[PDB]
């Protein structure tokens, strides 16, 4: 059956501020679909259609830095994914001379350095998503609207991003965290029982390592989960209160950095959910076949 | 006194990493709470009696210590205070002679002043509730167990704090905020209205500062009321879910810290949103007497 991890592509990590999160997975920060959907929200003022060329020129380019600042990483990605393939893999880790003790802490020291590479690598293009924010701001003074500033477009999304809500079945994640956190938490607490009977060498200690990645992921799938459900809520209490029909053009600025921000990152976490989604499956296979070999170990012990 | 601020304690400022939030009102952290709630698991556990002590010393005079700090800043809160008070009040404007966007101005600068002052003399202090939780660590590893840690302390404070939670009506504070937005943001649409047919500039700018404390407000009732349900949520998740009787010391450690600070996030923010609450009111009360003002000058021409 299933014993290897081939994708590892759930490690993130956040800036020093937690405003900013890096993943693996392409855009790579939510801001990207933000930066997008301005171009979407441009294309209907007249006033501000030179945004096509800062999309093509500034938004793609720091895509494709972010892409490249995440290639930079990839030795050290490949270096963590060796390891965590040994200390997954009884049948692996046989084949190889170091202790488990000693995999166990270069993979502690791998997952950090990887982890920090993602951040480091990212953080002059972290400073450039301020930049071209700032520019969209600068950009939107040239509307011909001042203190009469029309609320259309603003209100004509929001209708378009409810329906776009309504193709998560977000009962469907809530299910799904809550029967896999008790299956991890039941795992751990049979594996607990059988290590005060016996000591198994590397069998146990290999699903208990899987384990805690499993805890780990576990955690992103919240994570994610609690951040595409506020932006949810947000735009649809937005949908629920009274509609003004004009605003200033300040509060424009704030009208669109709001609905613009909360939709990507309700694109954004649902690809992040989604690829935690087979992440988590893929980790329950595997300590699935190393508890029926501990099993066996169990019986020829007694 | 009719159209004037009393207390401006519905000001706060998280640090730079969003994980301290600092509040006007005692205890200024809702960490000092995750120090109190330890005091009742040390007190089942013989082998870390010490904390007593270090409850009494260095979390006591952390607690005296962030009040003094937030006492420094009391000339810059009279000050803000005072600027409040003039830019609120239709008569007191009347009553000086600086005008109104010098005002606003003040009010801006002496606002981010007084709030930096709550966060810059508060560094300290935050450094020393990091100093705290290493030593609880620290104290934790003197359990006399490895893999074999009872959970019953653990799960009979889960108990307690569900009991407690019982007692907010969160659906009260939502019902209040989603209301209290659209009547704030009424309010603005009618200022729109009416300002295209009346010049009351005075009245005007009163009604709109008020409003733009409003708008204040309410996101910082909005952002405690986020906090307190989702630590609700996460400590209601523990008890829906599978309980082990026995885990690992370290495991044990995370336990306490986590039901810990979340029982302290629920304690913190019930008062923040209590004084919170109270504040918008008072603010639209003034916007009522402020309208009903406005709609006087617009019957006399």
């Known amino acids: 059956s299933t014993n290897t991890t081939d994708n590892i592509d759930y490690f993130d990590i956040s800036d020093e501020s937690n405003y900013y999160l ?24 007249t006033e501000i259609k030179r945004y096509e060329d800062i999309h093509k020129t500034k938004v793609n380019s720091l895509l494709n830095e972010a892409s490249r600042a995440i290639g930079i990483c990839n030795r050290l990605k490949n270096t963590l994914k060796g390891l965590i393939n040994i200390l997954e893999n009884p049948q692996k880790f046989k084949t190889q001379r170091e202790s488990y003790d000693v995999l166990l802490r270069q993979y502690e020291e791998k997952k950090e350095a990887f982890r920090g590479c993602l951040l480091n690598k990212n953080r002059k293009n972290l400073d450039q998503i301020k930049k071209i924010n700032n520019e969209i701001r600068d950009l939107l003074e040239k509307l011909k609207c001042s203190q009469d500033c029309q609320t259309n477009v603003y209100w004509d999304m929001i209708k378009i991003y409810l329906v776009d809500f309504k193709k998560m079945p977000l009962e469907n994640y809530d299910t799904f965290i809550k029967q896999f956190k008790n299956s991890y938490l039941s795992y751990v607490d049979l594996i607990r029982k059988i290590e005060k009977q016996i000591d198994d060498p590397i069998t146990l200690n290999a699903i208990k390592f899987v384990l805690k990645e499993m805890g780990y992921i576990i955690d992103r799938f919240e994570y994610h989960l609690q951040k595409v459900k506020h932006a949810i809520d947000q735009v649809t209490a937005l ?9 200033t053009k300040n509060e424009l600025k704030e009208y669109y950095f709001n609905i613009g921000n909360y939709y990507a990152i309700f694109k954004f976490a649902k690809d992040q959910l989604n690829m935690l989604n087979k992440a988590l499956i893929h980790k329950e296979k595997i300590v699935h076949n190393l508890l029926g070999e501990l099993f066996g170990h169990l019986e020829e012990r007694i």
Do not use: T
Request: proline share 6%; charged share 25%.
């Open 22 to 45: 890096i993943s693996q997975l392409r855009p790579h920060f939510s801001n990207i679909y933000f930066f997008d959907e301005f171009k979407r929200y441009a294309s209907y003022h």
């Open 239 to 247: 949908a629920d209160g009274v509609k003004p029909k004009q605003v």
